[PDB]
Amino acid sequence: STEILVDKYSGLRIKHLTLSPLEISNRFADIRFVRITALKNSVGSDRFSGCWATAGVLLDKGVQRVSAKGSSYSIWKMGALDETDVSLFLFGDAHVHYSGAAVGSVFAVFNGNVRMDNGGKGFSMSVASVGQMLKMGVASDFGLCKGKRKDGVACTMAINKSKGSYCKFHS
DNA sequence: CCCCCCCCCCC
Ligand SMILES: [Zn+2]
Structure with missing residues (x-):
């Protein structure tokens, strides 16, 4: 049957679910968790200094990219299905091991390096290692x-099917 | 060699 976790x-x-609720608390145990929507309003307040993590839905896998060094990488649109998104850069092993993921997946992101662009492009984070990505379901x-x-x-x-079936662009 | 790697859709 249906098995849904309503995650705090x-x-x-x-x-x-790829893990138990207990396993979640374990991964997030000694980590400062920041809600993916709070991110843009959390820049420059010492939120990402230590070990931290966030979690969001994979909205858009974008297009294949190539680093200046010649390596492939990804740029993902992540969000809480609420008109607010954020950019995630997958480098190296992280790209190798997760670029095939399915849109709609819920990923926990660990210790991403943060870039904030107040010129309009906004919040983005990047990761390069396998353990920085955890598919929760x-x-x-x-x-x-x-x-x-x-x-x-x-x-x-991407939409919230519980709240409607159309974008901001369609009404 | 490893680390490093960084954005123009959908109105
Ligand atoms: Zn649409």
């Missing part, structure tokens, strides 16, 4: 917009 950490609802509220683009292509914006 991420503030998300997760199905297809699948967002039970995740869905794709049922609306269509201007050119007739099905919209691929």
Whole structure:
């Protein structure tokens, strides 16, 4: 049957759990957790100094990229399915080992290096190591917009199916 | 060699 966790950490609802609730508290035990939506308002307040972690839904896997050094990497759109997103850069092993992940997945991110751009591009974080990514499961509220683009292509914006079936762009 | 690696959709 359906098995849904209503997580206090991420503030998300997760199905297809890859771990027990006890295992969650263990991973987050000695770590300062910051909600993925609080991130942009948390820059420059010593929130990311020590060991920290966040968690969000994979909204967009973007396109294949190549580093200046010639290595491949990823740029993910992550969020809590609430009109607010954030950029995640997957480098090296992290990209190798998680670039095939499915949109809708719920990932815990550990100790990402933070970049904040007050020029409009906003909050972003990056990780490069395998243990910096933990798939907790699948967002039970995740869905794709049922609306269509201007050119007739099905919209691929992530939505909260519990609160509606369309983007900010479709109403 | 390792670490490093860094953004123009959907209105
Ligand atoms: Zn749409």
